[PDB]
Amino acid sequence: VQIVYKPVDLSKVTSKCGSLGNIHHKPGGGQVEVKSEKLDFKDRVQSKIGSLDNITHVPGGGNKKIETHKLTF
Amino acid sequence: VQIVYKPVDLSKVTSKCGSLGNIHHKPGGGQVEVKSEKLDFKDRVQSKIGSLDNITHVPGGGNKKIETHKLTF
Amino acid sequence: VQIVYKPVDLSKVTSKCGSLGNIHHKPGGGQVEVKSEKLDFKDRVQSKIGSLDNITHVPGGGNKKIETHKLTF
Amino acid sequence: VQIVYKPVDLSKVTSKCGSLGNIHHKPGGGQVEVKSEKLDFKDRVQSKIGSLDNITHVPGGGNKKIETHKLTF
Amino acid sequence: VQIVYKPVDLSKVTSKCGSLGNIHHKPGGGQVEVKSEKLDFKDRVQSKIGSLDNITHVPGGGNKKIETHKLTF
Amino acid sequence: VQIVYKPVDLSKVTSKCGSLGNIHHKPGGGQVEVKSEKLDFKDRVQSKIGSLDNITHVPGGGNKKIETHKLTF
Numbered sequence A, B, C, D, E, F: 001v002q003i004v005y006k007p008v009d010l011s012k013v014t015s016k017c018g019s020l021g022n023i024h025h026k027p028g029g030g031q032v033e034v035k036s037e038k039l040d041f042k043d044r045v046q047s048k049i050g051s052l053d054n055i056t057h058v059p060g061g062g063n064k065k066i067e068t069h070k071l072t073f
Helices: none
Strands: A002-005 A012-017 A020-025 A032-037 A045-052 A055-057 A064-072 B002-005 B012-017 B020-025 B032-037 B045-052 B055-057 B064-072 C002-005 C020-025 C032-037 C045-052 C055-057 C064-072 D002-005 D012-017 D020-025 D032-037 D045-052 D055-057 D064-072 E002-005 E012-017 E020-025 E032-037 E045-052 E055-057 E064-072 F002-005 F012-017 F020-025 F032-037 F045-052 F055-057 F064-072
Touching: A002 A064, A032 A045, A032 B045, A045 C032, B002 B064, B032 B045, C002 C064, C032 C045, D002 D064, D032 D045, D045 E032, E002 E064, E032 E045, E045 F032, F002 F064, F032 F045
Parallel strands: A002 B002, A002 C002, A012 B012, A020 B020, A020 C020, A032 B032, A032 C032, A045 B045, A045 C045, A055 B055, A055 C055, A064 B064, A064 C064, D002 E002, D012 E012, D020 E020, D032 E032, D045 E045, D055 E055, D064 E064, E002 F002, E012 F012, E020 F020, E032 F032, E045 F045, E055 F055, E064 F064
Antiparallel strands: none
């Protein structure tokens, strides 16, 4: 048995941007009011209140090559 | 048996943008009011209140190449 | 048995951005008011209140190559 | 009279367990509210209220051999 | 008369357990409220209120041999 | 008369546990409120209130051999 596994790649993944900017992200500008009375928790509680986990992501290029080569005999 | 596995790939994935910008994202500009009375929880609670997990994502190029090569004998 | 595993890569993953900036991220500009009376917790509590885990991420290039080679006999 | 009582016993009672666990028992997570007004007992009273006599029993092996030998002459 | 009582035993009662754990027992997580007004008792009262007599029993082996030999003459 | 009473035992009652642990027992996590007004008892009263007589029992091996021999002549 001969197996020859010779995949060849000359690919390009490219971008050109003349400028990138003037980007505004303002989560949670409105007031948040939470009022709790006489509550009863008999098991686990997770509480998030306000402005959490918000992302601004502005990469000058966010290009991806994802590449898997697999041989199973 | 001979198996010759010789795929060749000269592809290009490309973008050009003259400029990118003036982008405005404003989640949760409105007020949030939560009033809770006499509630009773016999099991687990997850609570999110306000402005959470909002994404602004402005890649100057967001190009993707996804590529899988598989041989099973 | 011969297995010859000779994958060849000449790839490029690239970006050019002429300028990158004027990026604004303002989570939680609104007031957060949390008022609790007579609450009763009989198991674990996690509480986050205010402005937490917000990300600004502005890489001059955030390009990725991900490349996996596997041979199983 | 000759009586020979010679039962012979090479038996095995056996278990193998790869792992045992992740067992949750939560009796009485609901509230109990008892309101008694103007009751009249002319004899003995036994009252159990709440969470009583609850068993969790998790033996790593819970085998029984029960063996009775009786001779009546 | 000859009576020869000679039961011969080579029994085994056995377990092998790879691990035993992650056992949770939470009786009476709910509240108990007992309100008694104007009650009359002519005879004996036993009252149990709350979380009583609850058992967690986790033996790494719980094997029993129970073995009774009786001769009546 | 001859009575020979020669029961013979080579038995074993056995366990092997690779690890034992991570056992949690929390009786009476809920509050107990008892309010008694204008009650009248003409005989003995036993009252248990709160968290009483609760057992945790975790023996590394909790095997039993019970072996009873009786000859009645």
